[PDB]
Design a protein around this nucleic acid. Structure first.
Lengths: 209, 124, 63, 145
RNA sequence: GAGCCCGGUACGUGAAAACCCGACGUCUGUCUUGAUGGUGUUCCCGAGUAGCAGCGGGCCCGUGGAAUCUGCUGUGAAUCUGCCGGGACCACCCGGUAAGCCUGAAUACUUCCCAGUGACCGAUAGCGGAUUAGUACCGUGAGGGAAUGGUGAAAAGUACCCCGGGAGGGGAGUGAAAGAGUACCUGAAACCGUGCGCUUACAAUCCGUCAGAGCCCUCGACGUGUCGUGGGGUGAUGGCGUGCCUUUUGAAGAAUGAGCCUGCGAGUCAGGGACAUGUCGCGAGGUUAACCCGGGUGGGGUAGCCGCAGCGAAAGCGAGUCUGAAUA
RNA sequence: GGCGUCUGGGGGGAACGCGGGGAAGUGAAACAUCUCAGUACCCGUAGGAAGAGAAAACAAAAUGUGAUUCCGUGAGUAGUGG
């Protein structure tokens, strides 16, 4: 059981969250986390690579000269692989790279990852990043300076709280996310993780039932 | 994805053709011709490494035998005598003696003369 | 696509509980006028497949 | 702390592909096909045996038919009853589906393999006389449908 | 190698006219003279059709016991106790009411257009076509069908002089560099030559290798030149020694293939496919498909499949079952 | 039939569709039935989508479903087959 203190931009604390024990005391399985991130990246990767084999190229559909009497070798098309202009043989093709990793392996990855960060005290919470309804990236940057010094960081802000997203978007390191599409690559690439409290509550009362 | 092959070949070409500076003709310019000769060459080197032992030993023996025969003893009985006398010197060094210091070699000859059997063709 | 099955190997080959392969036996249909009954009697029943053809038959049955 | 350059699959998981026909040190000039013949140029089927009438053409066919209107039942044995009903009591198709002893669209049957000392008011479609008697001995209700 | 130079992005703006969406009011119809139920019998309920026979097509179905759907000929019925189907057929029950007609949405596709993405190529690749490209050239004709990208930051593209008929070059200049001169980024090898050192015209050489005289270069310890735990180029002379690959019982082979260089050129992909085996999660349970929501790789989705009991042709029975008169 | 007037159609298109016609090399280690494939190709007509479409249907005595089409499964199964 790990406790977190919410934090405010104006220089105060509101309250404390008492995180679960089973989500955030999982022991990581490095092979599991490896497999899953590899799958994510593979499904990201698009298969725009195609080549024209011997049967799609232009021409070649006439035996260019005799079989015998000539002196030279035997040839059946002017577009075969050994020519210069000829067909690719076993080329790239447009294909899919997704692979079907299961729900339990995925979630085990995510819980183990959040545990790896929590044990090392890199999960910070916060009510908000901003004052009312006017984005200003200088605010959020100063607040993250208060709360953090590392290069890179993750931010979990919901959908409705658009101002925090619009604010912190432009920063160099930051990589913002909604907790409905919470994943593993984006967690592990970071060093610190900033949850909103609404986000934590949603995550927890969505998983726990 | 497409991988031009240039470097990955140039490497071994450079190697071989460095190792064939001295060959005479198309064995000194062209990879497909120097590769073959490198096969034959390394092989002949191997074989000669195994056989220069016998070459030198042959040489040493000829020297020893001529030295002895000018001191009026045969090689075979010389080595019989040194074996009997438990003398340990090998043939490389007997030859070196023959070249440099024939006196010491004549002394060894005399030792063997002394230590040989009396009746060399006896039935013993 | 899928791996299609072999009709004959499905109609002349089954599998038991523990994975054995089973067949029937030969020279039973016709010309019984002269075949003694003991010869007609060891040909009844089923019989476990040989070793040598088990693999071939697996490959035919499954795909 | 973990990063992405700190992930590594388990030992022995990944394995080096055989790239065949790229060297006379590993597999060269034949690629494990040997030399000339039908298994070198192309390949060969599985259901061809030289020319002699194959096993799947010289053995008799199995006898009979199927009766397409067969009713396969899905069984439960009393062992699993005793192993997942300590308190005993009423046991229907859904009570069984709960513990995960049969399928969802099941048409059920009851059979007396294992021991029976618990008391159970079992409901199924059809039974066996061994279950009739075993329930009779453990004092229960074998009220079939 | 530009967040703060430029172009532009986040963001907000903008349309006289035309075009498309609905929105309306016109305009057009349309029911309003009406309906709910009652009650006993005649009439109608899509005709050269449905059906049957003969040749045929396609349906899981190759004429088979072969329904349903159908094409051509020939024959050819009734209207509700009517008719067609429920895998020949017959009786009962069930469902439905043919031979008249229209019907959106989910679905498939991109000549063209607009905006972007890429663990796609980067001038022998990529569209055949980065260069006049379906051109030149070939063929009578249908039809085939090529090759050629790069100066440099900006042409400041060598004014002027000398040799020469001119090309071309040497100086003088530009330029950061002309080992950037409109034959121009770099600028390999084959190939073509010029110099310097050794060696070679009494010798029989798969052209090398092991020993090695002699000469020439070099590093270092020293001493008027000198050996060395040396190293490198040539190398007289001696010994040993029958090209490479493929295919062959067996090839140096007078069996095939290769003129040489450089670049290009052959176990690949799909698929909850099959079998075997490593690894990871779960564990008597395991897992989802299509799809829906998602700026993303995430959440859901129980229809399904594999296991959990089999024997038997089958009925069927069940830790037993099949055969059999039999616990034999 | 002839004369006058009025409105239509006529051909091109990269794929996609519906109706009709309609092969062969291949596989079967030969081959004709079969398969390749009702694919390629040819024809006639379209549309921005098409065609089908309102039960003379399924089903099995469950008191069931309720136009059609396209996707997943059933299923490489029941079966068919020199």
């Amino acid at each position: 059981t790990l406790k977190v203190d919410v934090k405010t931009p104006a220089g105060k604390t509101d309250g404390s969250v008492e995180l679960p024990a089973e989500l955030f005391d999982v022991e990581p399985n490095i092979a599991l986390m490896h497999q899953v991130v590899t799958a994510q990246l593979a499904a990201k990767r698009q298969g725009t690579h195609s080549t024209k084999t011997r049967g799609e190229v232009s021409g070649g559909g006439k035996k260019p000269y005799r079989q015998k009497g000539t002196g030279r070798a035997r040839q059946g098309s002017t577009r075969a692989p050994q020519f210069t202009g000829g067909g690719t043989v076993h080329g790239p093709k447009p294909r899919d790279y997704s692979q079907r990793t299961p729900k339990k392996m995925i979630a085990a990855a995510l819980r183990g990852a959040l545990s790896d960060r929590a044990r090392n005290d890199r999960i910070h919470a916060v009510t908000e990043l901003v004052e009312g309804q006017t984005p200003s990236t200088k605010s959020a940057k100063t607040f993250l300076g208060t709360l953090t010094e590392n290069k890179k960081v993750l931010v979990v802000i919901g959908r409705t709280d658009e101002v925090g997203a619009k604010s912190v978007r432009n920063l160099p390191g930051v990589h913002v996310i909604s907790p409905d599409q919470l994943n593993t690559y984006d967690v592990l690439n970071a060093d610190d993780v900033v949850f909103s409290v609404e986000a934590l509550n949603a995550y927890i009362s969505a998983n726990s039932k | 994805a497409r991988v031009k092959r240039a470097l990955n070949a140039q490497k071994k070409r450079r190697t071989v053709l460095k190792a064939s500076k001295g060959y005479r003709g198309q064995r000194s310019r062209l990879y497909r011709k120097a590769k073959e000769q490198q096969l034959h060459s390394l092989t002949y080197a191997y074989r000669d490494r195994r056989a220069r032992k016998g070459e030198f030993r042959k040489l040493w023996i000829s020297r020893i035998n001529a030295a002895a025969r000018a001191n009026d003893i045969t090689y075979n009985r010389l080595i019989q005598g040194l074996k009997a006398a438990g003398v340990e010197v090998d043939r490389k060094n007997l030859a070196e003696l023959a070249v440099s210091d024939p006196a010491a070699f004549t002394a060894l000859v005399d030792v063997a003369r002394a230590a040989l059997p009396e009746d060399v063709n006896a039935p013993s | 696509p899928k791996a299609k099955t072999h009709s004959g190997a499905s109609k002349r080959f089954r599998r038991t509980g523990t994975g054995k392969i089973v067949r029937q036996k030969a020279n039973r249909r016709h010309l019984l006028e002269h075949k003694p009954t003991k010869r007609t009697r060891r040909l009844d029943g089923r019989t476990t497949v040989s070793a040598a053809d088990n693999s071939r038959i697996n490959k035919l049955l499954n795909g | 702390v973990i990063k992405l350059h700190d992930l590594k699959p388990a030992p022995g998981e990944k394995k080096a592909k055989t790239r065949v026909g790229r060297g006379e040190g590993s597999k060269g000039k034949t690629a494990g096909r040997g030399t000339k013949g039908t298994k070198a140029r192309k390949n060969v089927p599985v259901m061809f045996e030289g020319g002699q009438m194959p096993i799947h053409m010289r053995l008799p066919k199995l006898k009979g038919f199927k009766n397409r209107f067969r009713t396969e039942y899905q069984v439960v044995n009393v062992g699993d009853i005793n192993k997942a009903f300590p308190q005993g009591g009423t046991v229907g198709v859904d009570e069984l589906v709960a513990k995960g002893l049969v399928r969802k669209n099941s048409l059920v049957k009851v059979l007396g393999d294992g021991k029976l000392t618990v008391k159970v008011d079992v409901t199924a479609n059809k039974f066996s006389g061994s279950a009739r008697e075993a329930i009779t001995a453990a004092g229960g209700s074998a009220t079939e449908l």
